[PDB]
Every structure is written in C-alpha cells, then in structure tokens.
Design a protein around this ligand. Sequence first.
Ligand SMILES: Cc1cc2nc3c(=O)[nH]c(=O)nc-3n(C[C@H](O)[C@H](O)[C@H](O)COP(=O)(O)OP(=O)(O)OC[C@H]3O[C@@H](n4cnc5c(N)ncnc54)[C@H](O)[C@@H]3O)c2cc1C
Length: 257
Amino acid sequence: SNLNVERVLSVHHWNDTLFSFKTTRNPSLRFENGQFVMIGLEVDGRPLMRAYSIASPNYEEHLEFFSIKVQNGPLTSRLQHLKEGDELMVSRKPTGTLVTSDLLPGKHLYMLSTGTGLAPFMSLIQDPEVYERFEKVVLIHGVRQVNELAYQQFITEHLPQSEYFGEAVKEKLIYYPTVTRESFHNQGRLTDLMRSGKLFEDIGLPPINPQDDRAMICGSPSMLDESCEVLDGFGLKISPRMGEPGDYLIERAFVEK
Ligand SMILES: Cc1cc2nc3c(=O)[nH]c(=O)nc-3n(C[C@H](O)[C@H](O)[C@H](O)COP(=O)(O)OP(=O)(O)OC[C@H]3O[C@@H](n4cnc5c(N)ncnc54)[C@H](O)[C@@H]3O)c2cc1C
C-alpha cells in the first residue's frame, strides 16, 4: 500500500456544511502550493479515497484540509465526525493544474473561487513567492450565505499580522468576498460583477487585459465555463495543457456525479 497514515491534530466547524481539519505530514509528501492529493478512510475492506486540495503552505510540517459535508457520503458523511487523534490515509504524489509555474509573468493575480474552491488558494496566499511575483493578488471567494465565508478572520485579521510576510499581505492582498442569497456589501455572483466591470471599480484596479493579468479558477464545473467565458472576453488565453504556461489556469473544485 503506497498510502501514508496521518493523524488528526484538530478540527473546526464553520457551519453545518463546512469544516476544516489539520493533520501530521510525512516528509516524503512534497507538493507545490495549489496542488491536490487523495485522502480517505478505511471502510468495509477498501479505503474510500477522494481528491482534496491542500489548504496549507508547503513549508509547514503539517497539512490542513477544507471540506464540504454532503448528506450522503460515503466519505463526508463519515469524515464530518473526524476527531482529534483519528487516523487518515493520504496518497504519496500530489498533482493538479493550479500552480504558479504555468502562469506567464504578469503583475496582478486573480484567484477566482466559489464554495470549497477556496481551499487551494489558502496555501497560495501564504506562499511568499506569489507576493514576490505579483504586484497585487486578488482573492475572490463567491458564496451563497454569509456563514459560508470560511477563514474570514484568518485572512482579514491574522494574515496581515504575520511576522514573516504580514507587510506583503497588507500591501498586496485584496480580499473580495461575494454573497449570493443574503444581504451583503458585495452582492451577487463574482462572474456578473467581473463581466460588468464593477469588481475592478470596487477594488481600484483597471479592467483585465492579457498583458498584465493572470488568473486561477477553482469552482463548480458550471462556474468554470462561465468564468472562462468572462476571461476570454477580456482577451485572456487559457493554458493548453498542464505544463504549458498561459494567461490563466482552471480546475474543478468537485465533480458532478
Ligand atoms: C482536483 C479536485 C480537487 C478537489 N478538492 C476538494 C477540496 O478541497 N475539498 C472538497 O471538499 N472536495 C474537493 N474535491 C471533490 C471532493 O473531494 C468530492 O466531492 C468529495 O470527496 C466527495 O465525498 P463524498 O463521497 O461525500 O461525496 P460525493 O461522492 O461527491 O457525492 C456528493 C455530491 O456532492 C456534490 N459535491 C461534492 N463535493 C462538493 C464540494 N466540495 N462542494 C459542493 N458540492 C460538492 C457533488 O454533486 C457530488 O457528486 C475535489 C475534486 C477534485 C477533482
């Protein structure tokens, strides 16, 4: 079995459909910030594995995962009961398309996400390299309800306080959460706010162009088609394949089964 066995260090529930947890990390597991790996539990003879983006920076000696809670699992129906000390299986080799290396040089990096698609971006915003490569980093997190804005305080209060890169955060990181169904100051779907050009007006940056702007997209399969349509409109060109650099990168946060 080519699977590492990690133990849960802590868990935290945001609401009844979201929760995060931290585990130990075997030093053989190396990854690029933004990549995903497979995690799972042993259930009735076979390990039940699922793809999960790593929500922690690669320089830390522990892992963190941001998870959804689906009525029927079979994984999250069980995973939601994770307790400190519980064991988890993690694969050996990470993979994925959301890495800064496949991004042609630019000055602004837009991270477009919805729901749990925020996960890979949590490791990216704590990567001193993205701050070294870009002038501004815009983290957009689209959601349905206010209680779904996980990591709010962390991004807003704690990150700017960092002793190692807090200055870069305050100076380069623009957090722009949008809520769809409830009263919120950034009302609507991120796709509509970007297409109309309002988003840029709100954040003080000029409209997107294929020379200064790069992006990464992680959300529902439908949100992706809609986001590509919006970015292609500004003239950006998607990377043709994993390993080939382009103006923007996309990856599904989950699949429609
Ligand atoms: C590259 C990649 C990265 C992924 N990263 C993550 C991640 O960081 N966190 C994560 O929770 N999941 C992630 N997923 C998908 C996720 O792993 C699976 O949906 C989940 O493990 C399925 O567990 P389950 O057995 O309970 O659900 P399923 O077998 O998926 O069945 C539940 C159903 O719920 C819906 N659903 C599933 N996952 C989600 C979700 N996250 N948000 C909203 N609706 C959903 C789908 O319609 C799905 O068929 C990723 C998938 C891929 C391909």
